Structures are given as structure tokens and as C-alpha cells.
Write a protein that binds this ligand. Sequence first.
Ligand SMILES: Nc1ncnc2c1ncn2[C@@H]1O[C@H](COP(=O)(O)OP(=O)(O)NP(=O)(O)O)[C@@H](O)[C@H]1O
Ligand SMILES: Nc1ncnc2c1ncn2[C@@H]1O[C@H](COP(=O)(O)OP(=O)(O)NP(=O)(O)O)[C@@H](O)[C@H]1O
Ligand SMILES: [Mg+2]
Ligand SMILES: [Mg+2]
Lengths: 440, 447, 440, 447
Amino acid sequence: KVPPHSIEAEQSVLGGLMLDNERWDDVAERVVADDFYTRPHRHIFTEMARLQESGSPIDLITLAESLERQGQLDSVGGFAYLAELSKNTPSAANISAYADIVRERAVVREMISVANEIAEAGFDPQGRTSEDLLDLAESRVFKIAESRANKDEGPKNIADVLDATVARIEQLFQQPHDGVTGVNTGYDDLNKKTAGLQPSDLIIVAARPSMGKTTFAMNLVENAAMLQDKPVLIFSLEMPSEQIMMRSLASLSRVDQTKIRTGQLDDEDWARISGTMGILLEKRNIYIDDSSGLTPTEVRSRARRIAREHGGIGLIMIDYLQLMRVPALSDNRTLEIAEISRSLKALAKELNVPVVALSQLNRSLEQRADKRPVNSDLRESGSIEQDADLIMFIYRDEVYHENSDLKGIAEIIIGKQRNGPIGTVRLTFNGQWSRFDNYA
Amino acid sequence: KVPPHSIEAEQSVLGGLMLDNERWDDVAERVVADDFYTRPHRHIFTEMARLQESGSPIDLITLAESLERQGQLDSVGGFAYLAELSKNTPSAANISAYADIVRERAVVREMISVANEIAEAGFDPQGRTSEDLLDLAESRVFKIAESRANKDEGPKNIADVLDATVARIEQLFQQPHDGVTGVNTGYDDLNKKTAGLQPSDLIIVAARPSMGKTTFAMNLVENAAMLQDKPVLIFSLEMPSEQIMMRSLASLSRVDQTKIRTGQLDDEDWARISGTMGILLEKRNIYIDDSSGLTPTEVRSRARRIAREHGGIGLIMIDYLQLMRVPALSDNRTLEIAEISRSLKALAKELNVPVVALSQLNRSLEQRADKRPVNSDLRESGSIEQDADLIMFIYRDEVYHENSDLKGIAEIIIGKQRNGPIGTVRLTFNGQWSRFDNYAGPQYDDE
Amino acid sequence: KVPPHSIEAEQSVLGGLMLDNERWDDVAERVVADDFYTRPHRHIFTEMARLQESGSPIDLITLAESLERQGQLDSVGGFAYLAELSKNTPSAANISAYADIVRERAVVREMISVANEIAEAGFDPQGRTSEDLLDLAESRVFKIAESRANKDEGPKNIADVLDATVARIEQLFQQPHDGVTGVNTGYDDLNKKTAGLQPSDLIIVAARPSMGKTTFAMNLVENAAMLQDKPVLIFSLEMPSEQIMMRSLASLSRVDQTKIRTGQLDDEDWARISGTMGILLEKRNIYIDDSSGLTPTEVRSRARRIAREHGGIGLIMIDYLQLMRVPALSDNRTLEIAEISRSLKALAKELNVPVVALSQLNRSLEQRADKRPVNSDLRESGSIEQDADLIMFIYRDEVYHENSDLKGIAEIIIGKQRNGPIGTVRLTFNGQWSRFDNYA
Amino acid sequence: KVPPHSIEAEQSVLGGLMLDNERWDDVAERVVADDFYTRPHRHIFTEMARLQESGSPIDLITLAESLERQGQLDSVGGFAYLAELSKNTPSAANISAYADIVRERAVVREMISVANEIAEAGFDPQGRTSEDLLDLAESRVFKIAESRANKDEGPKNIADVLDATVARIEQLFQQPHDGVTGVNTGYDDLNKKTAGLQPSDLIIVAARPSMGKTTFAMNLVENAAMLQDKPVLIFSLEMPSEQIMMRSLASLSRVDQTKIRTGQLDDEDWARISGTMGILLEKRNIYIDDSSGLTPTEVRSRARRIAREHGGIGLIMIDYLQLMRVPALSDNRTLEIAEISRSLKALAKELNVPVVALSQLNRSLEQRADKRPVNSDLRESGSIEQDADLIMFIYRDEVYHENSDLKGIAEIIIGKQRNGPIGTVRLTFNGQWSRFDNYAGPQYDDE
DNA sequence: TTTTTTTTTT
Ligand SMILES: Nc1ncnc2c1ncn2[C@@H]1O[C@H](COP(=O)(O)OP(=O)(O)NP(=O)(O)O)[C@@H](O)[C@H]1O
Ligand SMILES: Nc1ncnc2c1ncn2[C@@H]1O[C@H](COP(=O)(O)OP(=O)(O)NP(=O)(O)O)[C@@H](O)[C@H]1O
Ligand SMILES: [Mg+2]
Ligand SMILES: [Mg+2]
């Protein structure tokens, strides 16, 4: 089959570049040398780009001279071909439209070539599984989507930013929320400082092991799921889904987790758990993935799948950042952490969803006399601090000091809040129920 | 070209369904009639599904009669073809694998057809823009992804987790395990907090040298072996198997370890040891691999081999983690510890067996005024605290303080317990027999 | 000529694997894919290994499907060939013997190929010397012998452990060895505790070179040689043959080493040296072969070479164990010393020789406040604290402390001892003649 | 194929034996009749051996008569063939090399025949197991190695090493004659441990920049030149010969080098320098080559040239090895350093002269709290430690620490000494004259 | 070789 191309549009673009050099910027922004169908056209555009990068004006004589210097004058068709191309183009008024048509043709041919590669891989598995071929096809499709999504980037005037800002301000003012700007946390004090879980925010609640960090994250997930209808997504890499469900049942029904774990439960608590399960089946918005060692690309694919199937995602829960595995940057832990944080922040900005990702800390907290967590106390910190916008720290003096009077009191200390002042929220922790409640 | 198909696997599936009707459910869950390459095979599977939904058993005569009544007997090839299909298939033991093969072939053919459609759309835009074709291709790829490893495998859901949780809770309530849901530790106090050795748990018993850490681990192994029939696996990397067995005989027969080490044993203790050996040969559930510096891959291979041979593994014993060596991450000890911990937790989740991994402590324990071991006092903890769920620390103030009143009292402090609160279980240690027993003295409070 | 192969045995093995999957472990232990003569059989066994490692049962249909997915179904002969192979094999009862025959054929073909390579090297020297050709031939034959190895590990049954333990108990109790059990060490305290130089043992003394450790090993060699005529071997990496000989003469003759080195002409020392060398000639088992810069695999090869020469090794003296520095592990010496110790223990079990090494510690022995050889004084601790079966540490406080607390009671502290009580073994040392005596 | 042989070398050997009978001993020691490829050559060598053992001189006529009496004259080719063999050989000066070539050819032919036998045994096991064939191959290769056992050998056995022991005792009886066994260093303490500069020794004196390494090397050169008459050779690659001469004049005349460099010198020090120059012109045993970037081949050629012209070389000075450049191994510095060290060691063994080869250090020394240099601290270490025998390191704590009490005290620490115990030689450094002298202060007992 | 920045531990 003949590949879809428009050689006449390429000739018009090249002739307009020969005539006009001010509209060269539009052509350079729109298309590249690879977008031209014929290889001589690619060479011509490459020579034009090299001349314009040097600051030389784009004319027939200098272009032919440069092609002869590189020996490419004879390969492209000769100087007579260049003169014919210069003659053919009347004007460059619609050269942007011609470049758009050329880019359309190039994208279509790229899609056709990728489809041919997919068909070849299908006919020749070469020992690959179906999942590998599916992942390769999805990767190629996303590569084409990224290649087409390149015209969005561009420096815009302050007027457009002002119009978007005043439109958003009018939208916010016309929509009554009573302090609930983001997803409702279920805690009154948290809904005053943070004013809800804002979308496209990296929520970092890092704490020590056996501090109720997973428990508090689960409580936040439960409160959000009860206070919203948008489906949530849980990635419990470390904790099994069975333990997560047991903790959820203990927290929501206010029943001791020990009796649930042993299974020694009375029929009244059984009925309470049954009612909680009925409420959950009424919601059916929770999807817990217990797989561990997942790259952020897989997490992004799963999030896109759930958002496409279920109409967006209310919340994305991550077990903690120190359990995520990237084969590419597995050599250095800090580089891996930075890449994971960057990918998760890009995903959160992409789908406009608050992502609750926990983390661990460092031993220096125990080294300090005061065991209040700081930014440097975070395990492999820095890029975590930079990429995230809402970082909190769980503090429990009851754990450190047996004589502490803060027993039951958990201090969620906001390590970082870009929009708004940071603080410390006191809550009531029930170890038996594993329930975090508003402290009176 | 020729579409990728496996007619032989389809014939094997059809013959196995004609022979075996109990494995129909796996075939129905895995594949449908559309997964069959040939249209007669689609007809055959459709008729099989129709007969099975009616409750009719799947045999040759009833299927032939049903195809004759619908007139599809000649469409599928005839009764002789069906008889040939029934004859060719030897057994239906691997019919699940054949169904997986058919599903793979159908998925690849679907992918090829979708690629052909996308190429046709590319060559013929039909007025659609690039964005329209891209969205169509994305929709087709998403449909294929929804037709392969979709929620039928259950990657992430709520209702399935609820059903599994309520089934487990009902099973635990009906089971008269009486507190000990996991593998029995042989210690009543330990069976109250930890509720026995739960499967897929990384058990960390950390102690200073000469604290009877390996002694207590072997006591737990002996208690589990006497309280279960599932075979255990011991990796005595640090100590030789001779010393381990001598300590085991001293603990079980309650004979002085020094006398055994000198060999000067009377005939009464000799008869007690012989009876213990007879009990062990009755069990024969203990396999000790005293190879040192083992990679976790070798340990995983040995565990899979033993589980295949002896029908699972009850317990996995590891003799202190810093002896285990990973040549890939031998450059940095913390990376080695993290890799070992991750691989051991993956193995514990894989085979559903409680892994008892011992560990050492830090020198900061001597530096602090209170010598009770904490999580940070672990010898290069790192991911040890994160991956494990049953971290414990042996405390012997008798060793630290000569004037301590806790002589024989060894305090096992639970550093981390994910499910349940933490505490301190005191036990009676007998250094002569090297025996840890339940403390029957005054019940001190876990402060 | 036709290479020696048994295709029928290969067909029987493949058909038995198709019939029986339980005996797959025996075939995997016995042979590999390379042992199959024909390349299609190699591909078939490779596909079988890939299927069984995935957990899939090995049958005809799945194997054919996997070969078709990899495209190797047409290469091996087609599905009909596989069906014929499955049909031909009656049973898998004797598949172990068939696999042994296949392994024998593969080893014989390997030997034939190696002989052809040696003949080619002989015909075309390519500038190599005859010594190079001989070393290459020895290396090739050693590689064949190493490839002719078998299973070395495995979780032992409880019955075997019980038998070994009761044998050890009977050895400790019944046997009236009265101190010495193996080769006599010479030191009375070492005679009691270490029970002599036990064959197939790893005795590593960790101290400073030319600081009493070298003469300690020399006295060990002398005492071993005075009570047996078994050929002992010298592998001193510290001092040459002449200097070691001078040290040995000074130690045995009780003559000041200043007179041994700097010639003080007298007939009393000459008569003592004459008597010493007469006793040495009476023993007639000291074969000098000291060198520098080797690996314990080379030491094992030389042990086999000496066993070919004479047969039986009484003692190997490894002076300056830190002179085998591998540049890859020269910085962190702990792992290198651990690997060397493990290979030396393997060599000791191989030829039944009490392998004794002289590990070098750090300068902190004279610098740290803890003058005794503790983990700070040990070379990055690690392999000096553990691994080695007999890690003796020479606390010679004479060198460490100017006003020594140990003069004639210098402590041979044993960190780990398989047979004998650990502790500080105080021994007398004569600095004048470089002679280590035995303190009561 | 054709077996590898050199008939021409055999003919040269036979002709040289026919001409020269004094070199028969070397031929008998090296080769036998079996090393001759042709059977007539074997017969000829057998007759030659029989005649020489009988005491008969080896000439053409007597050998022809001896072959005629045994009837082997016709078997070897006749008298004309023997006359041709006697005619063809010009001289027997290189008959030892010809015998070595013949022995090499015989060894290769024996190896080929053994390989043929082993391949024949491999193709036809004749009931032998794989272990039997392996042991047979090992025995055959060991027999080939045993054919040259007296040639390829290392340390000797008990009786031979005892004879070497008593011989060395008799030799070291003569050792207390001067104390210095090699070239006198001029330093009493250095002449105790090292016993002077031993010939065929690679002396690596490595230090930090501006540590007096070149200064101390020049002091050693001056001491050797004043204590010997054999000519020395200096390769001042780093510094020009002008600075070298200024340092030499400052050291020998004990005048400040700063005043010499500025030229502001009094007439008394001028007369001292003139007397020193008169002493040097009396000696005239110093030859400096200040060219930089020189290959070891050029250095070896110049050394052989000087040894031929001036009757050997007393000392070879190299101004630090990393300045030496090899165009072939310029891609990798470590390979270049190893090649340079190997070539210099080969040259030192060739001419039997101690070579003064300086070296630089690494920056890991300043990283360490104790700045005492070690063997691994050497710049591009490894092969340097292997090839050299007299490695020393200069330590000056006065440079590192301003409050150090070792001002003027420079410690030469021996890192490697194959023949002798290593130690720390303290010296007194005079920066003004740049003079290294024996440390006359209180001796420090090295802890 | 060089050169940065993170954890852990002694
Ligand atoms: N039945 C119970 N009674 C009392 N306390 C309990 C009970 N069950 C759980 N807990 C407590 O709940 C907390 C669980 O904390 P958790 O969030 O699991 O730690 P974590 O930080 O998430 N683990 P990790 O993220 O891997 O470091 C601990 O403080 C337990 O003591
Ligand atoms: N007139 C002087 N007065 C005092 N000190 C001096 C004088 N002249 C030289 N020095 C010292 O002498 C030393 C010169 O040593 P020198 O041997 O040239 O260094 P180097 O080892 O060759 N450098 P490098 O080759 O990079 O290792 C330095 O410590 C100078 O400070
Ligand atoms: Mg958690
Ligand atoms: Mg210099």
C-alpha cells in the first residue's frame, strides 16, 4: 500500500521557508525533518535548520551552497530541483495549515508503522507472553500520544492566565462549600487547615513502624469513601488485603481488632460488621491492589484503567514509597525515590486526584532528644519534600515515653503545606478499635 | 498469513470434556466458544454449554443426539468426527493448560485483527482526524486489555475481599483452635499475644551473642514439630548441625548440655535420648541444611523442592541473617539486608509459611543506660522493621547485671506486632539443659 | 569420525520426561541441554526446562505449543516427531541410567573436543611457548574434571543428623585419645584443647607477620614433622626459603637469630644446626614450594599435583595470608578472607590436610587501647571474628605494650573453636631464638 | 600433517660437534638422540655419544670409521652425507640455541603424539571409565612435564635445600666483612635493614609532591657516586638537570639552595662548590638525561649503550614512573604502568644494577587520619607491588601538622622488602641545604 | 581515574 503523504504540502512549506524566514519558527514548532515523507525533503529541512541555527537567512543560494558543502546537493535532486521548489510556491500565508497537514500525515504513518510492528509481534511471539505484547502495544500507543501532545507547551500571555484565574475564582465563589475545598477528610480540624484533600496534591504522611500510620491512612480512606461517591484506589503493597479489611472492620464498627483476628466475635458485633459490609456494597467504590514491587508506570496504567472504566478516581492510596521498585534506577535508592515521586506527582497532576502516599523515617529522630519529626527525618528526603505539597508527621509521645500524659493523643504535625500555615492536629487514637477520632 | 491457532489443544479440550464433566467449570471460566478457531468447534462448545446448563452429563451420545436435534451434527463434521475427538484425547488432567493455550491463541488473533482494523483506519481516514483515530486505537487496546487479565483475575476490588474476609472469620469462629490460629509455639503466653505462628509472617528474634537466641529458636522448632505434622526446614548457617542437635537433645530430654558436650552420659539419659530419637524418627519432619552463605534464591529453590516432595513446609528456620550472602549486593551490607528481607518476605507470602529469621543487634545497646533492645538497635535493620510483622527481642538482665533478680527470666519483648498490641513475655531459661519454658512464677506486668 | 553419542537414550529420557514429571529432578541433576548430541534435542530439553520452571507439567501438547510460540516447532522436526518420541518410550523406570549414559557420552565428546584443541595448539604454536601449551592443557583437563563434579548441597534428613551427632558424642565420650587426636601440634595446651592438628580443618592464626606468628607456624611445622614422615608442603608468602630456613634453625637449635643471620663463627651453634638438619634429613618429608600471589583453587590443584608426585600431605604452611590480595576485594578484605577461608576448608576436606593460615591484622593492634586482638584490631572484623573454624589471635603484649603484661604468658585467644574450650591460651615465647614454647 | 621439526638445526648441531668437541657437554645436557627428528640423525648422535664416552675425539673420519664398523654408515646416508653435514655448519658458537630449538621441537612432537594417544583412547574407551581416561590424560601430561622436570622447577626438596642451607651458612660466614652487601646507601640505618642497594632490585621510593623524594633520591645518588667508581645514569624526566645540579651542589657543599638559586653566593661557599666540582670531575661517573616522555625501550637502549661504552652502570635513576610514557599502552594508565614496571624489572635483572625508580601517591592518604603511606596508597598500585622488592615511603608529620615534634625527622617506612624485615628509618632533613643525614637523636622503638 | 549526594552502621 501507498503510505499516506502530501508531497505538495511539503513543497509549499519548503518554498515558503525559502521566501519567508519569519514564519520559520512556526514550521520548526510544528514539524521536524522526520515528518517529511521523502528523504531528500528531510535533508533539505535539516540543512535549513542548520543554516537558521547559524543565523544565516534561508535563501536558495546559501541552501544550495550548504548542500554542496555537505555533498547533499546531488542527492536531493540538484540545484534545478531547488529552483523548481522555490518557483512553485506562490506564498506562505497558509504555511501553518500545510505544516499541520504534514504533521497529520506523519502521525498517521507513524500509527500505521506501529500497527505493522504490533501485527509482526503478534505473528511472531518469539517466546513473549500475551501480557508482554499488551504492555508493548500500550507503551507504543502512549508514545504516539505523547508525540502528538507537543503543541500544548508554549509561553502564553498574562491575559490568558488572568482570564483562567478569574473564571476559576468566579467558579469557586459561585459554588458553596463551607470550607470543604478538597475531598472531605472526616476530621473537623483537618478540614480547617487543609480545607479538604485538594486534587493534584502529593499527600505524604510518614511515620515510624507500628505507629498507626497505615491505620490512619485507612481511616482517611474510609472517611473519604463515606463522604464521596467517586471511586478510590488502594495500593497495599506491604499490608495484605485481609489485614486491611480486618482493620477497616475494626475501625468502622468500633470493635477490638484482637477478637476479630481471633474470630471470637459475638452476634451483635457480627450484625454491626454485616451492616458495615452492606454500606460497603452500597458504595462498591474501593479497589485494593495488594501486589508489591510495582513500577509507577504500572500504577499509572491501572489508575488510567480505573478512571476510564469508573469515571475518574476519588483517591489513590499507596502503602509507602520505600516499597516501590523501579528496575531502571534500582542501583541508587535516592534516584529511584526521586523518579517515583516525580512520576506520581505527574500522575496526580494528570488525573487531578489527591494521592495519599505514605513513607518511612530515619533513625536520627531517635538520636535527637526531641523526637518530633522534621523534614530531614524523612527517609531519603529532599525530592520527597520538593515534589509533595501536603506533608504531615505523626507524633505520639505515649509511644516514646511511658510516663507521657499524651496517651491516646496523636499529634499529626504538618511538615509542609505550600498553601496555608502548617500546624499540629491532636487526635484520639484507639489501639483496640484502631480508630482515629477528633480530639475534644 | 495463517492465523495463530492450536487445533490440537481444542480437540484435547473437547475430548476431555466428553470424558470428564467435573472440570467443565474451569473451561467455562477460562474460555468460551468464540475462543475456538474453527466454527464447528464453536458449535460444539455452544452445544456442550447448552447441555451442561440443562444439567445433562457431557458424553458422546447425548451430545450427538443434541446436535442431531438442532441439525448441527453435519455442521460440526459428523458423529465420526466427534468419536475421533473423544478417542484422541488420553486424559483431561492438563485441560486447564490447554484452555490457557486456547485463550492465548484467541487473544493473539484478536490483537492481530484489531491491528488490521487500526491499519485500515490509518490508510483510510474517512474524514476522521488524527485525534479520532488515536482515541479509536486507545479504545480498541483498552477493550483487549479488558479481555485479558481483567477483573476476572481480581487485581483490585472490594466485594471479593469482603467475601474472603468473612469466610476466614467464619472459619476461625467455627474452628476450635482456642486462641492458637497459627502454628503452635508451645508457649501459652506467646500463643496469647501472637496467637501462634501465623503463616506468611517474617519472625525476627533478635538478641546479643550468648543469649540463647539459636537455643530459643530451636526450642520453638521442637515445639512446632511436636505440635504439628507438616515438615519443617532448618537453615543452620551459623552453628553446625551437630551442636544444634546436641542442644535439641539437651532441651527435649532435659539433660545438661555440658555433660553431652563432654559425652559423659549415664544410661538413663541415654535411654531418654533414644526415646526422643524414636519420636523424631516417627515424625521425620525435620530437615537441616547447614550450608553457609546461601543466597535467598537457593533457599527459595530448596523450600520449593521440599514443599513439592513432602507436601508443603510447616516452618522455615534461618540461623541469623547476616550470614546470608548476596553476591550481587555484597558491595553494601544494607542493600544485602534489604534484598534478603524482601526475598524472604516474598517467599513467606508465596508458600504461606511462618519464616523464623534470627538477627543480631547493635553496640548501642551497651551504650544506653537501659539495655532493652529496640527496633533501631537491630544490626542494620533498614527494611527489617518494615517487612517483618513478628519482631521480638531477647532481654537477659542476668547477663548484663550480676545482681539482677531476673536470673533465668528471659524477657521476649515484641518490638513490632502489626495485628495486635505489643508486650513482654517472660520465660524461664535453663542454661544447663538450654531450655526455654513458660514462666510459672509471679506474673509481672508488661510495662 | 562419528562422535560417541546415544540418541536412543536421549529419546528414552525425553519420552520418560513426557510421561513422568516426578523424575524430572533426577534428569535435571544429571544432565543439561548441552549434553544432548543433536541441537533439536537441546531445544526440546530447553523448552522442557522452561515449562517446568514455570510450574507447568511437561506433556506433548504444551511442549509443542511452546515450541510453536518460540517458532522452534518446525526446527526440531515438527509435532509428528515429538509424538513419535513420546510413543517410542515405554516407561521412565530406568531414566536415571539413560541420563547417566547420556552424561558419559557428553563428557567423552567433550574430552575428544579438548584433545582436538590441544592437537591444534600443538600443530600451530601461534608464538606460545611449550610451557604455555602444557599449562593450557592442564587447565583444560582440570576444567573437564571440575565439570565432572556432582551434587554438593542438600537439606540433610533428621536421621543423618542424628547419626552424625551420636557419632560425635561417642567420639567425645568413648575414645580415650587423651588430648591429641590428629597430627600433634607440639604445644601442650594446643595438644589438650585443639586435640592436635586435626586433618580436614581450618586453623587460621591471626597476628602480625614477623611478630611471633611466623615462628609459631614454623614451630607447628617442626613439631608435626618430628612425629611423622608424611610429606609436608611449604607455601610461605612472607619470607623466602632461605629466611624461613634461618628462622627454623634458630627456633629448633635455640640459637639467637642475630648469630644465624649475621655470621658469628662458632662450632657449638654449627653442631646444633648439624643435629637439626640431621633430624630433618631423617624425617625427609619437607618439600619446599613457597611462592606468592595465588588463590586457594590453585593451592588445591597443587595439592592434587603433589599427591600425584608422592601422595598424602602432612601439613601446608600458609604464611602471610594477606599476601594473596585480589585488587577487586583488596579494599574490603573481609569478604576476600572469608572466601579464601571457605576454599581452604574445601581443600582441607578434599585431601585430608590440616590447612593452617597466617592471617594479618591491622596496625591498631599496637594503636587501639584494647591491645588484645578484638574487632577493632581485626582486619575490618568480619571473617576474622567468624567463618574460620580455629581463629587463634596472638595477643603478644610484648610488642603492643612496652611494659608488657604478658611476658611468657602471651595469650593465644581463640575466638571460635570447634573442638576444645575457647579462651586466652598463655604461651611462652623466646624472642632471642624466635621460638614459641608452651606455658603451663 | 607434517610433524614440527627443524632439520637445519640438527645439521648445524652435528656439524658443530664434528668441528668442536668442547661444547659436546652442553649438547648432551640439553638433548638426546631421541630429540633428533630423522632416524639417521639419531644414529649419528648415538655414534657420537658412544665415541665420546670412549674418549675418542669427534671428527669426520673417526665417526665414519665407527659407523662403518657397526654397518650404520649406509643407514645414515653415507660418507658423502657426513661430509656435507660437516661442510654446511660454519661455526658452533650458537649450537646451544640450536639444541634448545631441537629440544623444543621434540617437546612439541611428544605433546602431539600424546594428544593423538589421548584422542585415540577417547574415541575407543575399551571399557575404561571417564575417570580412567581422565587419570590417563593427567598422567601423560605429567610425564611430559616430568621430561623437563630439571628444567622447569622452583624450590628444592629437603636434602637439596639442606645442602643449600649449609652452603649459605658458609657464605654468610664471609658476610660480616663490611655489613653492606650491595651498593652503599651512605646511611648507617639504611645499610642495616636493606644492607645497601642490592643489584637487580626495583627500589620504589614514593612520596607526596614537594616531599623531598627527588631530593632524597639525589642524596642517595651523590652518596653512591662518592662511594663507588662505577658510572651512574640519571633520568631526570620531571625536573631539568639545572635544578638537579643546584640541589646536588646545595646538598654536597651544605650551602642554602635559595642563595644558589638567587646566585648571591660568597667566595668561601664558591670555593666549596669549586672543590665539589673538582671532586666530581675526578669522578666523572654521572650521566644525566633530562628528556621527558621516554619509553622503557629507549631507556634500555641507552643503558645498554652506556654499559657497553663505560663497562657497566653503577646506578640507574628514574624521576618518578608516571612521567614515563608508552604510546602503545597510552589508552590505559594502569596497563602502561604495569608494562613500564615489568620492562624496568627485566632491565634491572638483565644488567644486575639497582634501579632508582621513584613514584607518586594517591589522595586517599590525606583522607586517612593517619597519613602514613601504605602499599595500596600507591598511585596506580598492584603491579608495582608485584614487580618491586624495595618499596619505601617518605613520611613527614611536620608537613601535615604544624605542631608536630618530628620537625626535621623524615621517616622512610619500608612497605615491601622481599629479603629482610621492613622498618622505619628516621633521618634528619635540612631544608636549607636539602640534605638528608642520619638521625643522630634518640632512637624511637617502633611500636 | 576523578567527582558529587544520600541512608545505614561502628
Ligand atoms: N488489637 C490491637 N490492640 C492494640 N493496638 C493495636 C491492635 N491492633 C493494632 N494495634 C496497633 O496499631 C498500630 C499499627 O500501626 P501500623 O500503621 O500498622 O504501622 P505501620 O507504620 O503502618 N507499619 P509500616 O508502614 O510497615 O512501618 C500499632 O501501634 C499496633 O500496636
Ligand atoms: N632553599 C630551601 N629552603 C628550604 N626548603 C627548601 C629549599 N629548597 C627546597 N626546599 C624544600 O625541599 C623540598 C623539595 O623536594 P623535591 O624533591 O623537589 O619534591 P619532589 O618530591 O621532587 N616533588 P614530586 O616529584 O611531585 O614528588 C620541599 O619540601 C621544599 O620546601
Ligand atoms: Mg504502614
Ligand atoms: Mg620529584
